[PDB]
Amino acid sequence: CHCVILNDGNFIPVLGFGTALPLECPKSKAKELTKIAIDAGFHHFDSASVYNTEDHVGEAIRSKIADGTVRREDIFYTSKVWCTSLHPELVRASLERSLQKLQFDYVDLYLIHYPMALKPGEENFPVDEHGKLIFDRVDLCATWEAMEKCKDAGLTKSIGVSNFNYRQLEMILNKPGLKYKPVCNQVECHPYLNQMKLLDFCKSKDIVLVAYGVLGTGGWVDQNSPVLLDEPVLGSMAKKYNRTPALIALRYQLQRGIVVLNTSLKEERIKENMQVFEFQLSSEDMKVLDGLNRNMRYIPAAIFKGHPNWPFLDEY
Amino acid sequence: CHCVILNDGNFIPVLGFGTALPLECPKSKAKELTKIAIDAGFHHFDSASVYNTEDHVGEAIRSKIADGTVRREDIFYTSKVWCTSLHPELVRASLERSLQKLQFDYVDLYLIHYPMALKPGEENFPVDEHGKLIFDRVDLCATWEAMEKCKDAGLTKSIGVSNFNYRQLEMILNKPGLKYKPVCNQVECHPYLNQMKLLDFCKSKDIVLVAYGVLGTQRYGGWVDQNSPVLLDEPVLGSMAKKYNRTPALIALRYQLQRGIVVLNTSLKEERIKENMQVFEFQLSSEDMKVLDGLNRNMRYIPAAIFKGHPNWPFLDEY
């Protein structure tokens, strides 16, 4: 493995495969993609209870274990508790359900998906008659204590968070009687939103930053206007190193000590990910990439914008 | 043709097929889709110079004219001049280039795509080293006069605008020496953004409101936002669909037709393409129309965000 140590003693592969699927795709597509990713060399798989793809991803993994491609111990599986189960007593319940769907005995990492609670229930997006989310309030420190207990019960080897801004991380870190610090903070990160300040903070607290939406992500204008991968600097550097604009973006994060999660529906693209270990960017080129930062948040989770705990209002 | 009259005497089919394709589709996809629509009964096709599918669309259309399925005069084709060619002297050149690709003698409708100009050039989204769109200053009244000439030259039968707000329409309507009022204003419109005020304004000025994004849109590619409830998930639409034994989509389409709006819709699915024609097989009661009116929440799914900093960005005013 091309791994990095977590503050709790566990190791996580620096390259992971995201299992979230496009709205149009049959959830079963996750199974095929997971198998392809495994054959391509991926050992780290990122999922979440809300993606409703865990049963298929679990089947893919158990199938590659059964034919001897990999062993459970060599796989790093991550799940996340959704907004509707942040209530302390619902945390463990959701994790156990995921393990049931996966037919696993444990997950390697369990994260709080967002620092925002929503009305408990089967619906992942509970809304009123006006289509507005029914927010709920919870003590994130209580939710955290429940995460700690899951780790102690052996249901998850490590625990961390996702989409937490620095102050929210602080709430957990300064929590009285804290037992386990989150091992990571999974957030959107790429050349247009390099998360420099948040990264420096996490590193200062021995927390690993895990990036999703590393290559970026409606109407014709909004769908055809230039996006991250259209960046001329990446295209130029890609030709300079004879790789792809995507590989430049992926490599950029690795050289910053960031764990990267990537996804694709195409086998060739999934396989190309492994090239991120085949080359290196020069200090000067790393500095050039640092200059692309333009605070462009592609995954704002707009529907939550009115939530008291929306993490993206603060600078970082 | 289920057609309605325009303020210039010409008629437009009340249902049209948009020819804009998802960035992940070979531009040729537009040819097969257009032929399918034509067989399904579509006569109205909405395109734009920027979509860069005009050649493929013209191929399909001419193909159906050749085999006798339709006549050129039975087809209503719309094109639009992009932000980079709004300068009075570039308006006609853009149209002639589109006709060349289509291999058409004329287009039935020609529109100003957005009331915002961008740096001239082949590049459609010119940006600086900071990734910011390079805006340009233009006189829309002068642009409009260039559109009027196109109509006088017979290159387009009618002229209109798209994504203009009420004051921007006024700018044109109150123009000294105005020869032709725009026949329409093509804007985003659906139950969550019914454009009541802009509609009432257009009606008062004899302007037809043409709607796109009629079934909602999901701009954000992020999982959470793409997986949160969408317009078609609306319980009122699902409940009403059951009442009339139709689909939530058909209810949303019929809603617009009864308001005097011309609807544009698209789909990569042949089955959904056909389904559209069902909108003409039923009618919504006046009571239910009122019910649908209550669904408005000023939810604009197509904000053209990249343009948000432009002086003429049309979505700032109330309407």
XYZ file of C-alpha atoms in Angstrom, chain A:
316
model
C 0.000 0.000 0.000
C 0.898 3.640 -0.627
C -0.360 4.556 2.813
C -0.323 7.262 5.503
C -0.523 6.798 9.283
C -3.612 8.050 11.127
C -3.413 9.560 14.607
C -4.939 6.402 16.090
C -2.287 4.060 14.724
C -4.206 2.798 11.689
C -3.075 3.173 8.077
C -5.156 4.478 5.179
C -4.302 4.230 1.448
C -3.524 7.689 0.059
C -5.669 6.962 -3.020
C -9.312 5.938 -2.639
C -12.289 5.202 -4.890
C -15.508 7.127 -4.261
C -18.655 5.038 -4.565
C -21.249 7.780 -5.013
C -23.192 7.293 -8.257
C -24.725 9.711 -10.802
C -28.463 10.082 -10.191
C -29.227 8.317 -13.488
C -27.150 5.195 -12.782
C -28.762 2.019 -11.422
C -27.364 1.580 -7.902
C -26.093 -1.802 -9.102
C -23.530 0.114 -11.172
C -21.545 0.528 -7.934
C -20.873 -3.211 -7.890
C -19.354 -3.291 -11.364
C -17.304 -0.170 -10.725
C -16.027 -1.478 -7.390
C -14.846 -4.696 -9.043
C -13.103 -2.736 -11.768
C -11.443 -0.475 -9.195
C -10.246 -3.501 -7.239
C -8.718 -5.092 -10.333
C -7.129 -1.714 -11.067
C -5.369 -1.852 -7.699
C -7.615 0.218 -5.428
C -7.757 -0.913 -1.786
C -9.459 2.161 -0.334
C -13.189 2.529 -0.977
C -15.231 5.498 0.180
C -18.957 5.134 0.700
C -21.754 6.455 2.936
C -25.099 5.199 4.236
C -26.930 7.887 2.276
C -25.527 6.777 -1.131
C -27.591 3.590 -0.892
C -24.802 1.741 -2.722
C -23.273 -0.089 0.265
C -24.983 -3.426 -0.409
C -23.616 -3.477 -3.971
C -20.151 -2.270 -2.977
C -20.099 -4.907 -0.248
C -21.021 -7.586 -2.774
C -18.238 -6.466 -5.104
C -15.665 -6.636 -2.304
C -16.854 -9.989 -0.967
C -16.702 -11.341 -4.523
C -13.085 -10.256 -5.034
C -12.284 -11.760 -1.644
C -13.956 -15.046 -2.582
C -11.916 -15.422 -5.775
C -8.719 -14.557 -3.942
C -8.078 -11.170 -5.550
C -7.949 -9.449 -2.172
C -8.462 -10.141 1.530
C -10.736 -8.106 3.836
C -7.677 -6.934 5.753
C -6.205 -5.374 2.625
C -9.390 -3.416 1.952
C -9.996 -0.048 3.622
C -13.743 0.652 3.656
C -15.200 3.960 4.841
C -18.842 4.676 5.662
C -20.549 7.794 7.007
C -23.525 8.453 9.274
C -26.115 10.645 7.576
C -27.719 13.833 8.960
C -30.850 11.939 9.994
C -28.980 9.688 12.434
C -26.722 12.149 14.258
C -28.788 11.765 17.433
C -26.389 9.882 19.769
C -28.570 6.767 20.011
C -28.996 6.611 16.230
C -25.276 6.634 15.391
C -24.520 3.028 16.284
C -27.847 1.930 14.815
C -26.948 3.328 11.402
C -23.469 1.787 11.468
C -24.876 -1.650 12.292
C -27.399 -1.359 9.455
C -24.583 -0.515 7.033
C -22.616 -3.566 8.212
C -25.777 -5.614 7.639
C -26.073 -4.324 4.060
C -22.339 -4.836 3.468
C -22.375 -8.177 5.235
C -19.174 -6.944 6.945
C -18.144 -7.283 10.605
C -16.535 -3.846 10.687
C -15.691 -0.811 8.578
C -12.229 0.700 8.634
C -13.414 4.277 8.989
C -16.687 5.876 10.079
C -17.321 9.594 9.650
C -19.977 12.146 10.535
C -21.087 13.030 6.973
C -21.947 16.686 7.717
C -22.147 18.707 10.948
C -25.871 19.236 10.366
C -28.693 17.159 11.807
C -32.034 16.641 10.050
C -35.342 15.180 11.281
C -34.880 11.473 12.106
C -36.644 9.090 9.752
C -36.316 6.838 6.718
C -36.228 9.823 4.348
C -32.705 11.146 3.859
C -34.001 14.565 2.765
C -37.051 15.293 4.964
C -38.779 18.435 3.702
C -41.864 20.478 4.574
C -44.628 21.372 2.107
C -42.422 24.109 0.621
C -39.583 21.733 -0.192
C -37.391 23.080 2.598
C -35.306 20.710 4.717
C -36.603 19.959 8.192
C -33.542 20.803 10.278
C -32.987 19.275 13.700
C -30.553 20.135 16.464
C -28.005 17.837 18.060
C -24.946 18.159 20.271
C -22.092 17.214 17.922
C -20.026 16.361 20.999
C -22.663 13.818 22.005
C -22.666 12.435 18.475
C -18.896 12.229 18.769
C -19.021 10.280 22.021
C -21.277 7.815 20.195
C -18.666 7.554 17.418
C -16.004 6.847 20.033
C -18.108 4.040 21.482
C -18.479 2.478 18.015
C -14.688 2.429 17.740
C -14.420 0.850 21.205
C -17.012 -1.790 20.290
C -14.876 -2.668 17.273
C -17.564 -1.793 14.722
C -15.168 0.718 13.136
C -11.384 0.845 13.407
C -11.175 4.628 13.063
C -13.479 7.620 13.298
C -13.343 11.039 11.725
C -15.472 13.758 10.200
C -16.432 15.230 6.859
C -17.337 18.768 5.829
C -16.390 20.302 9.185
C -14.941 23.806 9.194
C -12.098 24.607 11.610
C -14.303 25.899 14.441
C -16.449 22.748 14.332
C -13.276 20.665 14.502
C -12.245 22.765 17.509
C -15.533 21.964 19.266
C -14.646 18.284 19.085
C -10.948 18.722 19.869
C -11.623 20.819 22.991
C -14.428 18.528 24.129
C -14.086 17.646 27.834
C -13.175 13.998 28.277
C -12.358 13.554 24.592
C -11.136 10.000 24.006
C -10.302 9.828 20.294
C -9.499 12.749 17.999
C -11.016 12.431 14.559
C -8.364 10.910 12.308
C -9.465 12.988 9.341
C -11.692 15.656 7.866
C -12.987 14.763 4.417
C -13.718 17.936 2.464
C -13.943 19.162 -1.143
C -10.432 20.030 -2.308
C -8.778 20.860 -5.615
C -6.628 23.561 -7.308
C -9.534 26.038 -7.325
C -10.213 25.422 -3.603
C -6.914 24.124 -2.210
C -8.064 24.447 1.425
C -4.681 25.858 2.488
C -5.849 27.328 5.801
C -7.962 24.324 6.799
C -5.142 21.958 5.750
C -2.593 23.762 7.913
C -5.027 23.601 10.821
C -5.691 19.882 10.468
C -1.982 19.156 10.141
C -1.369 21.230 13.284
C -3.798 18.987 15.161
C -2.512 15.774 13.593
C -5.636 15.323 11.466
C -5.351 14.089 7.878
C -7.223 16.003 5.191
C -9.056 13.701 2.773
C -10.160 15.325 -0.462
C -13.157 14.548 -2.646
C -14.277 16.356 -5.790
C -10.576 16.525 -6.674
C -11.338 16.965 -10.386
C -14.305 19.249 -9.842
C -17.735 17.849 -10.700
C -27.517 21.846 -15.332
C -28.445 24.365 -18.002
C -26.364 24.596 -21.164
C -24.353 27.634 -20.025
C -23.820 26.209 -16.550
C -22.832 22.839 -18.019
C -20.684 24.129 -20.891
C -18.880 27.042 -19.260
C -15.211 26.292 -18.396
C -14.591 24.115 -15.345
C -11.572 22.920 -13.345
C -10.438 20.254 -15.832
C -10.576 22.898 -18.578
C -7.880 24.843 -16.724
C -5.127 25.756 -19.225
C -2.395 25.456 -16.588
C -3.397 21.828 -15.951
C -3.620 21.149 -19.674
C -0.209 22.705 -20.245
C 1.362 20.885 -17.312
C -0.314 17.667 -18.446
C 1.390 17.983 -21.820
C 4.617 19.025 -20.105
C 4.648 15.808 -18.059
C 2.732 13.883 -20.699
C -0.023 12.808 -18.328
C -3.609 14.070 -18.125
C -5.016 17.245 -16.578
C -6.683 14.914 -14.078
C -3.413 13.226 -13.138
C -1.813 16.626 -12.557
C -4.674 17.557 -10.209
C -4.405 14.243 -8.366
C -0.621 14.453 -8.018
C -0.873 18.009 -6.697
C -2.850 16.773 -3.680
C -0.577 13.797 -2.977
C 2.475 16.033 -2.809
C 0.670 18.094 -0.178
C 0.138 15.068 2.041
C -3.565 14.923 1.215
C -5.453 11.637 0.820
C -7.331 11.649 -2.476
C -10.665 10.100 -3.414
C -11.592 9.824 -7.075
C -14.358 8.290 -9.172
C -15.324 7.535 -12.757
C -17.740 5.380 -14.739
C -15.034 4.532 -17.283
C -12.618 1.662 -16.660
C -9.744 3.327 -18.516
C -10.031 6.413 -16.315
C -10.248 4.340 -13.133
C -7.054 2.538 -14.148
C -5.207 5.779 -14.975
C -5.459 6.806 -11.318
C -2.563 4.495 -10.468
C -0.307 6.707 -12.573
C -0.411 9.307 -9.806
C 2.411 7.256 -8.255
C 4.453 7.268 -11.468
C 5.643 10.875 -11.572
C 6.330 13.979 -9.505
C 5.625 17.674 -9.915
C 8.470 20.152 -9.463
C 8.531 22.641 -6.578
C 8.018 25.390 -9.130
C 5.070 23.606 -10.723
C 3.611 22.992 -7.261
C 3.838 26.741 -6.639
C 2.123 27.442 -9.952
C -0.736 25.148 -8.980
C -0.997 26.838 -5.570
C -1.727 30.031 -7.479
C -4.918 28.685 -9.032
C -6.806 28.920 -5.735
C -9.939 30.973 -6.417
C -12.345 29.835 -3.706
C -14.582 27.915 -6.098
C -16.769 25.532 -4.089
C -18.417 23.080 -6.488
C -20.132 21.069 -3.734
C -21.770 23.670 -1.443
C -24.693 21.427 -0.453
C -26.942 24.405 -1.180
C -30.143 22.852 0.170
C -28.584 23.016 3.665
C -27.535 26.677 3.339
C -30.104 27.770 5.924
C -28.974 25.242 8.532
C -27.450 26.831 11.661
C -24.436 24.531 11.258
C -23.829 25.023 7.531
C -20.016 24.648 7.485
C -19.285 26.829 4.483
C -20.076 30.313 5.780
C -16.817 30.739 7.726
C -13.605 31.512 5.827
C -12.415 27.993 6.676
